[PDB]
Design a protein around this nucleic acid. Sequence first.
DNA 1: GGCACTGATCACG
DNA 2: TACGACGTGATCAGTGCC
Length: 341
Amino acid sequence: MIVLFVDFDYFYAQVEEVLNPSLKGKPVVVCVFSGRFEDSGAVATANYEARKFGVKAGIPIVEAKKILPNAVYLPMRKEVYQQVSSRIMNLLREYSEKIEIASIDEAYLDISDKVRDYREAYNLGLEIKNKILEKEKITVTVGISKNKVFAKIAADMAKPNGIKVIDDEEVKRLIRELDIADVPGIGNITAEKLKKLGINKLVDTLSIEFDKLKGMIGEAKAKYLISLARDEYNEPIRTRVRKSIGRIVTMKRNSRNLEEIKPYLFRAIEESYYKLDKRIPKAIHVVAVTEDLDIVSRGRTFPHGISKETAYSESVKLLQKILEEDERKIRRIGVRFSKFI
DNA sequence: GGCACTGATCACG
DNA sequence: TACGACGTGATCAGTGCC
Ligand SMILES: Nc1ccn([C@H]2C[C@H](O)[C@@H](COP(=O)(O)OP(=O)(O)OP(=O)(O)O)O2)c(=O)n1
Ligand SMILES: [Ca+2]
Ligand SMILES: [Ca+2]
Ligand SMILES: [Ca+2]
């Protein structure tokens, strides 16, 4: 199987630059202003001029200003990037019926039936990078190999504005030399559990007892890691169906006063229902981000779809179930809808 | 023993 | 004033049930 992975470059920043060209060359920082105070919130993404200096996704907007006080800071316009994205994705649908849209800026294409080899694959990529630059003037890195995982690792190595192949032979080299923490799906918490077992390379997972690996990271993560190690990772490209749609808002000040929380909950419900558009949920979950940042939640499944009215009333009951079952203070309240009809 | 749901955990964008 | 005017998919461990 031959898989082609497309990953738009520093996306939110790039789309901003494309909407206002004068921004090119200057460091740009797309942020999420929380509203609490002057410059509170986090950074969603920074273009490369800004990343060179340590300004990356996740750091507090105030920390980014200490580093680049004169960078152009813009407010995240998620709806905008989303539309640009949908237009770029549509373009990719001309290159394979089998396409898996991983996220807002990543797509997997199974080109097994469009090219006979990596040479033809690599040329299809180029054609695809161009087609996107033409129509939308957006650069994107292309990763290519036998499966989704190595295609992704491919791209990770090529970006920005690059392209790369990882043939069967390099896959074997990587199964041996590639740091196991750079394997899609291996977060910090797991990477550690592995280093705590002397596992640093994919191959190292074949010499350990299965249950010892299972017990430490989980049966699913172990099998995952093992198949990649045996070089038998097979996961077909499948059209993704959004399973849930929610929204979580930060409150002006923490608290556990139902009446002072309601507005935020109903607000979250409103936006959620807007985003639902035509999709009817049968399950509603109220999510809370306690003062100490833990995540608490309570839900309910109905044998029928949920009218907004039902969501409104039922959400309050669940919010309560969280107040009667926890004593900490809430910082971020929200709703989350699933099990669509 | 094993299928099927629920609140928490991890990873990632 | 130290992970978000942020989100979503997947697995896990507990437990209800034939
Ligand atoms: N912590 C994060 C990570 C990503 N994103 C959003 C903004 C990014 O622009 C977009 C795509 O994610 P990537 O991790 O691919 O980041 P970039 O596209 O910005 O950069 P690059 O792909 O060049 O590394 O998702 C976000 O809001 N918060
Ligand atoms: Ca990415
Ligand atoms: Ca990207
Ligand atoms: Ca990692």
